Design a protein around this ligand. Sequence first.
Ligand code: X96
Length: 282
Amino acid sequence: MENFQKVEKIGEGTYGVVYKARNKLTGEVVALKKIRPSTAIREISLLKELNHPNIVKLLDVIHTENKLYLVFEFLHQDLKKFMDASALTGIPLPLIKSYLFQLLQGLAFCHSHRVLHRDLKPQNLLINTEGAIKLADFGLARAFGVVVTLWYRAPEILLGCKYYSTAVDIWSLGCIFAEMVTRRALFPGDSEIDQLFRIFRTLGTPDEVVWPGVTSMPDYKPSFPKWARQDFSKVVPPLDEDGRSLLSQMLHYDPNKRISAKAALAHPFFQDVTKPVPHLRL
Ligand SMILES: NCc1ccc(CNc2ccc([N+](=O)[O-])cc2C(N)=O)cc1
């Protein structure tokens, strides 16, 4: 890429190295990802049309010299860094609420267009000085696929389900909502089984009553220990009942009972939502 001046290396993405770069001709500042399949090309190309204010814009898909580069809209900070920076005092509830509401709008939009993220985490939620938050890397997982953080993975994925549904994104977002509130990851597993068991220890080992079909999942074992569900008021204190109610619906075990993004937007928790200005030190 002789058409971009590398300004800085902003990460080691899931697919490749990412650079903050400036377009020599336009002056535009972008995030350039070097990806390490014509099916992938056509699919990625479709994402260029998936435009929404809460979705990081995919500006270009460059396939030259038999290499693949994705050019994305640039934002100055991610939520993981913001949460660390706000760890001492915590992100104020009004801003947590604004961010959750905006992320749900982004999910509702993508899901309505049959596009899933599949790997939502604080690191791919980007923020700016105007109080906006945007989802990055939507659709890349399906376009490709095959240390990885497991903290936000839905249980159906951990249990080996081969077909993901929009519900996996709602689960991840619920885990992020909980982390913004408590200032600690909800389920910081360090292996697939530790991740699964951490979920079970908090929400109870699932059974056929709460999750019809769970015992027939590919990686389900009757030998799983049976833990009782913890009182929800102990999981994300001191979040209010509107917040706990919404979170509980985002963390239902059965993907089909899990609340949709569209339905979550209507939850009473958002009755007083506003759009505060975060304090960003760049
Ligand atoms: N102080 C460096 C710095 C610059 C920008 C960001 C947030 N922004 C991103 C992070 C990762 C990535 N990434 O593709 O891995 C992209 C962006 C993007 N689109 O702007 C975080 C840190």
